[PDB]
Design a protein around this ligand. Sequence first.
Ligand code: EH5
Length: 331
Amino acid sequence: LGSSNDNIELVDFQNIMFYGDAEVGDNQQPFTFILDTGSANLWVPSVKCTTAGCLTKHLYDSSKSRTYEKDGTKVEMNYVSGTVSGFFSKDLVTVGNLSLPYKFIEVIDTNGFEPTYTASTFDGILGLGWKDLSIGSVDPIVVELKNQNKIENALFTFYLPVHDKHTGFLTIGGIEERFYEGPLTYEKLNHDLYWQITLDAHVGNIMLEKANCIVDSGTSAITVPTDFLNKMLQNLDVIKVPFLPFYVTLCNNSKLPTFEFTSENGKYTLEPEYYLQHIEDVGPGLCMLNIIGLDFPVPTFILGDPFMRKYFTVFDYDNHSVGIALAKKNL
Ligand SMILES: COc1cc(C(=O)N[C@@H](Cc2ccccc2)[C@@H](O)CN(CCC2CCC3OCOC3C2)C(=O)CCN2C(=O)c3ccccc3C2=O)cc(OC)c1OCc1ccccc1
């Protein structure tokens, strides 16, 4: 009686991250998660974790869960911003109202994930990538839930919150018309690794054909190939190596370009107001260009939160693709 779909409310954290709650264990031990479409593993800190970081987080106690199932296989999870190690374990996992015996990593050592960990307010990370991207070859939860016949579509959507405007939602199971407007385009993945797609980029005169776009919820910014970044930054009001770093500019700079991503079936644009972090409290119309330079073997743009904040996105395991639509401003 309600939404046939599973909705998890999302809270924004300083416009750099947003969290969601899920539970682990027969007894429903609560946890704050960072929903990362950039990784494919789920881990929670253990009560056995004795590092400083862990003293402020919520901890999983297997001895309290009847459904706990020991595994003990040692594993080391590494991201771009750090590593965490622990051993595998299996226990009930409750995401929203869908529970399932899932296999996660129990973390006991987070000293290689600082100051990120301690500086952030989450307990663990819930990967949403593909199995080829995970450790121990674990099927994605959203996929599992499908095989276990708890949902009909191996898909989830993101309606990112907007710092100071509204909260967001992760929907597991189906697409809801209330989050977007305008057509809902679908782009195919070029690899069943990350939610990566191919698009043409256009800025000033700058153009990059068949660029690889990775859509990541765990990236506070938009990444761009370095060369692409500086050609872009020529003349525009912006220094190098600030006081709270990177690129800064008067939020009112009329020279700021609008990104253009076009495909065979869609055209998506990101205006300055979407990639500009504010810091006017440091200067009347002062802003933090939210664009990082990053080079991959082949031209790759990481469409992070700045993009997912403007555009509603659907991730489809069944039809291997990422759907994009104009996210509603307030529902
Ligand atoms: C929210 O903040 C950010 C968090 C993360 C940030 O750390 N984000 C990761 C999630 C996260 C969020 C908060 C705290 C910690 C970690 C994650 O989404 C990034 N990511 C996916 C896309 C990426 C991103 C960058 C890459 O370089 C090479 O391959 C990349 C894939 C990975 O870490 C992949 C890990 N990973 C691999 O690398 C890899 C290679 C081969 C097989 C399997 C894997 C695998 O599972 C990243 C940011 O962009 C760079 C942020 O903005 C800035 C930032 C960066 C460092 C410190 C602080 C702030």
